[PDB]
Design a protein around this ligand. Structure first.
Ligand SMILES: Cn1nc2c(cc1=O)CNCC2
Ligand SMILES: Cn1nc2c(cc1=O)CNCC2
Ligand SMILES: Cn1nc2c(cc1=O)CNCC2
Ligand SMILES: Cn1nc2c(cc1=O)CNCC2
Ligand SMILES: Cn1nc2c(cc1=O)CNCC2
Lengths: 348, 348, 348, 348, 348
């Protein structure tokens, strides 16, 4: 007995949809949902999606409020739809997926992931919900997350961090590190060995190793001497070159964080969505050095050092493929006389 | 001789409506009011209200620019409408009241509060405006604020703070502490003895007593020992419990401010309006501890200590009613073996 | 072969329009442009202009990404249109000019600035683009910027700072100080001797002289004694008077920056656009001192001292005209007994 | 190399999308597409769909301009999608289907109906397009229309009429009567014996038999005597009873057409879509007789007489199922003492 | 002292803008202007233009309510702007021109047509307004209409019909036939010999000659015999060929009017604007004969006969240029063995 007024009642009284009975007066004007409180209209939701306002309001109310995989992981694993939940994309302020299963009558393609319409779609299953591990076993295509072992299913240990109501975090009171499983055409797929992006912010950047503490504290030349990085072009790739009109390198988030402490800069997120590699139009405020497309990845500095130190430096230019967040990331490696000139996540 | 172009002229030249003569070219497109400056359109106002764009623009231009009672106080006193002014609600970016008296032809129910349509409504009167004290005396229902004594009318000393153009402050150059009076059905009502909320922000929180300085500076155990708060569950209620998936307690703003200095958190204001008790969907970023409905009140720590220390702790569960901002706030008091387990502003 | 899908392709792949071939699927809903990525819609642009959404999207994509004069300089020089580029106004999130020349078929009045429709308009020319110095020579009306000398054309050295993708900066890796030239009715005009505004922010304010370091570090009385400013009303004009309900003086940005370090305040930008003199409705949060129209100018303190010390202080009230950013700024000078009472950028 | 500007160029020059090269300037404002002609904006399309304005404009431009089956026939046959065409629904001013195959990049689920995504969907194939008969033979699910015989496949003769640019007609210069074929899970179905609705208008109603000429020309009693319809309640069912507050019967379009010649009436199409049975809220203007839900079907009078004369009239109330337009239509048959009381297309 | 409220007051009381003092309460919601009457909102104007709603409302209120030249005549004469009036385009529900002179502060480029901004624009002058004949004499570019002779200037007799509040008519109580004059670069032009379109409707078509009475009354073969039109393909061009899937000919409005009496048809006006030649996507309802682009012109049958009988019929295909409504209309003339095959207004 789903309704707009019942969804709004749950939002007002429970902070989100919680299956409670009740109705509150609602008014819809343009792309905003309001409710009357003390005689005046109070905004409950502003539709930033391409779905109708009342439909997006119901999907947002029915969002998953447990720690869930970050949308970039779900996209890299080919997830098309979620089973009986909504994975809300807080970077886009929209549902991560077009359709639903057992959530909302307007967006539902099926009520259960067992319907034949779900067979060709990669359905997201959550082992924390009763019967979802078994639904994954019977699904033709799907991705499963669990907190423990599944009998006979070989696990892939995912990232330490998960998204809880839009906050990316490594859980202390809740579990955020899941076992990951994937099935393509009825066959459980071996997830590849992968690095993970650290999902940090530029404003609240914190080092997660002794090498990252030394990058942020030590000067460029003493850091490169301490970690034996001579000939690996860290001056260009990680630190960044701000001497010319075109900004050189600056592809690691830690390098942007070190620069951010000294001088500010504009990072234009021209495709605003969660992704393993992010592209920004950067403008350095101190120098005026800029780059239209500056690919940035948040790898742990130790992981980036391991990647670049494991490459053959005897070829002028080559594509280096590295698995990060379960996806193959192509990097462009440019060398000269046995030393690195540049290394960057290749712009497609 | 009111007009859209005249309202816009006053906004451009005087910063708000100031009864001046003149007109500027205006363009309305969707919910925004623009004016032509140097050949280009410059935004003057974005309608975030449920009123028509030109009507909301005129009410915002005609907003009260003197320190006025915060909307939560006006709502707790049952204020329906203001006399010949607009109380702008800066938390909702909308007028605090549906209708006006002597302000705008589109929203006016009357030109003077003496019209019979105003008799059943609780009209807000401001003693700082000539003839408004007398209009309150003749009103059937109303709320009056004054800077001094009114002959024969027993005053209620309101909060130290008032809102001046959306800034809540305790006035030094202006008076913000008013005498409050209320009339229901022609009869002046005795306003109850009340506590006041402190109206502080989490980002700019400042202690307003020696006990509040000690809460923020001292460790949990030495503070509870110094102020003899053993057995009053301050560890749960004020400090907050972040060890389980459900966030425990955290109902006093000062407790959130102390936590905010160490680790950040998301506070989702799902009913965004000014109220004595606020409800937030909180997510602790450090631990992942969360609570869908976490009621928070900004009381002075000394006032909260006085409330909890004045309760009988011999009953398992009971409703404790405390007058705060002239309204009765129900608190849920849970005890065991003569000690507090929890105390929180009861979720309705 | 211009198209919406081609503009969006360039934005997605190049960060802006870069003349590349290709098309991406686009969806327009209301005032927002989206593109499909991984099956979901991702916002590329939100129209904040009065132009149609697809037209504004194309003008924003075709924005000048080289350091350009700040819109206030272009407006003060009478610039109506740009030659074969779009000067994007980042303070208004809109094009600085109504029409274009050789940019977009919907906004174009001409394809080349040589068309007779451009003769009466003051066209902006950029000497950094091939053939634009010659187009200025043949234009009836225009403004030219160059990085070096133009044979026979007497230059005017502009401000040190320029806007690069909305970031105002003094270039280190790029040139931001241009030579300025102007022509009215076929005749090259002598640009007047002028002061320049410093274009600083209140949050990131940095002193640019020893006098500005002393203003921010020294107490009011020792600063006024050190720089011999007794009788020049700096206590009122620069420091500001917060003792009465009406805020006194506070017309220099450096004075607001000094106050901002101690106590916060609301600055309501009621005409949000780039201008030499800005008008704000200010509310001091500490005292409650407020002013509906507080004119603020960001001059270097040394420049403001030179202006006020070069005035005759023997008249009660007079208009003082000072050239700032190539425009004549009227100031109101009020004196008594040979001393300054107030000096402010005159409210029109 | 599809684009908004190219789609508009085709609309302007060819009256619809015709694969021609070219671009015209376009402006999108709200839900309307305009083009500049002689300096002014001219409306090309108003979006009445739930799709984004530019997407709906492209689907409308790419509509099928050949006589196609009426949407009610396609829906009754379970058609989900069309192969490389858009069946435009002129009753809804929207595409008849959610997705496309080889039409528009925004709505396409596949470029060819041979893609595995199309296998479970009932794809509409048109034998008039080269290779579509063979695509139907290889499709798992589909509906095929042809103008002549298909080797091996036994045909179902469809209705005489088809929709050509929203005009339902029986072709004289073009063929509108198609052979219909259908496959479910790779098996060619035996389409059932079916009646067809005549798809006539109330304003331009024309009789299509000698019995229909006699219904419109003769008086009620002489018509019922001539065709031996005594005891079949035609006075109620077809002619209509306007003597009570509730309008009696009036379920055949021919009966409404006969009434329309004498007196007018309001027919409120509360679910505006193409369907075998239509429901209207009818108000007779002459008498004031009204009915909230008056089901109307346009059957040939001879076909309706054959249906009612082939029923058992010995039961008080029963559901009578009739295959009309290939779908099962339920009728409610009410009898008393061997005579009809009422017979109507069941409201369910 | 122009205002939204004053424009609305005039609309309500005078039926249009009439320079009366007064103000009525107005509400703007989306693209509609409302006024409060007896407590409820009543729609005054729905914006169908690309201008802001309040600007379009004011231009519509300030529309010319005297018989004015039809927009197609003004466009063909190169009219850019009107002098101190608004020519409302009722076919587009929008102003015929982008800018105004002395009408509305938002659209005005000048207050008088004597301003230098108006010199290069072809300004429309109306001799019925005092001083406009003299303003035309002093204008560099312009078009003048008069009811009588102008000393020294030789006139061009325009069409009999004019538009009065959107009704095209030949005046009986008012004069609608104007003398036309035109100046280009200060020189009075010699307007060319021109035919005029008759501007008739299909639903209210009336013959305006004995030949037109005979076309509508006589049969095809006796009409062609009476007016000696054998070999001129009137069977195809004027009568229309409905025997094939592609509708043949049907380019004269009189031919469509004759067909309309017998059978109905859909005329899709895909570029809805006033033009000498109109293009329609036609669908004949009786036969199903259709044509995507069917150019239609409303010439007097005698004028069309004179044009086709004055052509050389010895070439297979050629462009025939005819001055109609002062513009050059291209026709395509196809011949074979000395006889016409087709003649149509060229689609270009
Ligand atoms: C943690 N980790 N991940 C990977 C590899 C080595 C490693 O230590 C090798 N490249 C792909 C993924
Ligand atoms: C300041 N203050 N206010 C109140 C009470 C005691 C007190 O000291 C008693 N509870 C209600 C209100
Ligand atoms: C740098 N500078 N500019 C000006 C003046 C003196 C000066 O030193 C005189 N007033 C107008 C402009
Ligand atoms: C007795 N009787 N009852 C009904 C109907 C016809 C009738 O004769 C038709 N609608 C449902 C109820
Ligand atoms: C032979 N022939 N060709 C054409 C036309 C008439 C004709 O007779 C008219 N449209 C263009 C092509």
């Amino acid at each position: 007995a789903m309704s707009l007024e019942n969804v709004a009642f749950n939002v007002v009284n429970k902070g989100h949809f919680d299956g409670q009975q009740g109705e509150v007066p609602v008014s819809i004007i343009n792309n905003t949902v309001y409710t009357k409180v003390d005689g005046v209209d109070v905004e409950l939701f502003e539709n930033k999606t391409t779905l109708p306002v009342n439909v997006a309001f119901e999907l947002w109310a029915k969002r998953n409020i447990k720690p869930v995989p970050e949308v970039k992981i779900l996209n890299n694993l080919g997830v098309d739809i979620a089973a009986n939940t909504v994975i809300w994309d807080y970077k886009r302020d929209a549902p991560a997926h077009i359709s639903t299963i057992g959530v909302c009558s307007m967006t539902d393609i099926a009520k259960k992931p067992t319907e034949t319409i779900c067979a060709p779609l990669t359905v997201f299953f959550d082992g924390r919900v009763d019967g979802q591990v078994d639904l994954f076993r019977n699904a033709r295509n799907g991705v499963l997350i669990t907190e423990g072992s599944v009998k006979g299913l070989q696990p892939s240990v995912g990232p330490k961090q998960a998204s809880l109501n839009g906050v990316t975090l490594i859980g202390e009171a809740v579990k955020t590190q899941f076992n990951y499983y994937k099935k393509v055409d009825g066959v459980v797929q071996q997830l590849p060995e992968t690095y993970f992006t650290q999902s940090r912010n530029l404003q609240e950047f914190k080092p997660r190793s002794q090498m990252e503490i030394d990058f942020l504290e030590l000067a460029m030349d003493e850091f490169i001497e301490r970690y034996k990085l001579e000939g690996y072009a860290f001056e260009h790739i990680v630190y960044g070159d701000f001497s010319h009109s075109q900004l050189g390198g600056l592809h690691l988030l830690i390098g942007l964080a070190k620069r951010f402490k000294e001088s500010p800069f504009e990072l234009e997120d021209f495709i605003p969505m969660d992704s393993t590699v992010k592209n920004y139009f950067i403008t350095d405020a101190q120098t005026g050095s800029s780059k239209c497309v500056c690919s940035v990845i948040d790898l742990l500095l130790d992981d980036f050092v391991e990647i670049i130190k494991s490459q053959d430096l005897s070829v002028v230019s080559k594509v280096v493929k590295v698995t990060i967040d379960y996806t193959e990331i192509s990097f462009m490696l440019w060398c000269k006389d046995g030393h690195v000139e540049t290394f960057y996540p290749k712009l497609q």
